[PDB]
């Protein structure tokens, strides 16, 4: 609790500054501190939390993929180079897992349980699915299955709520469906499920665009284009 002495509002202010400065590790630390104040988060604050951690873990994931590729090449008439590639991949991996565990911990203590509105609850459950998905990307042990199931379960709970409580064009509903489709294709070895989910999501959103303002239209169509990009890649 290094942020325990800082006002909630000052933490949020500094998170916004950190975002402007592209200091995402600081941003994440400020937002962790804000969460640990124990109050629920507004929509803007939820997005600050998400942006911060997604940028941190995104950098870690990219680094992990670089190192994993080098390691795989080392294991092909490749000359023995000793333990260093594996050691350093493991270092990065452990740090990535630590960040995922930190986010999951915030969600479990106590963001999800206090989230009663569909917008908040879906947002947090989507986050939960995403960070388990990131853990699944690097998992190989006796627990890859359990990690995959944890991701699936979170995504599924989010989906069920989103379908009941949000319009098909809601950006969080769309983003959830996008990420769950990625889970199906990339993690769960279920490309047909991925394709179906992306197609159904896109089509139901298309049919609801007429209800939207110009600005909401822009928000929804941005994510719809991502669904389309994946469908184009996958088919």
């Amino acid at each position: 609790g290094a942020m325990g002495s800082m006002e909630r509002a000052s933490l949020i202010q500094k998170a916004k500054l950190a975002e402007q400065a592209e200091r995402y590790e600081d941003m994440a630390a400020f937002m962790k501190g804000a969460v640990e104040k124990g109050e629920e988060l507004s929509c803007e604050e939820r997005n600050l939390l998400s942006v911060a951690y997604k940028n941190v873990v995104g950098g870690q994931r990219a680094a992990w993929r670089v190192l994993s590729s080098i390691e795989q090449k080392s294991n092909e008439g490749s000359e023995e180079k000793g333990p260093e590639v594996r050691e350093y991949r493991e270092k990065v991996e452990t740090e990535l897992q630590g960040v995922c565990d930190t986010v999951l911990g915030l969600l479990d203590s106590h963001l999800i349980k206090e989230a009663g509105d569909a917008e908040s609850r879906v947002f947090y459950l989507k986050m939960k699915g995403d960070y388990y998905r990131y853990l699944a990307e690097v998992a190989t042990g006796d627990d890859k299955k359990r990690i995959i199931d944890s991701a699936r379960s979170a995504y599924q709970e989010a989906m069920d709520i989103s379908k009941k409580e949000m319009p098909p064009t809601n950006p969080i509903r769309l983003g959830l469906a996008l990420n769950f489709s990625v889970f199906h294709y990339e993690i769960a070895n279920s490309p047909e499920e991925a394709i179906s989910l992306a197609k159904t999501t896109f089509d139901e959103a298309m049919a609801d665009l007429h209800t939207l303002s110009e600005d909401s239209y822009k928000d929804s169509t941005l994510i719809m284009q991502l669904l389309r990009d994946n469908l184009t890649l996958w088919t």
């Binding site: 942006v51 990009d229 996958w234």
Partner: peptide, 9 residues
């Protein structure tokens, strides 16, 4: 080529 997930903004 990797699938696209949600943007971070």
């Amino acid at each position: 080529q990797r699938s696209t997930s949600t943007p971070n903004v």
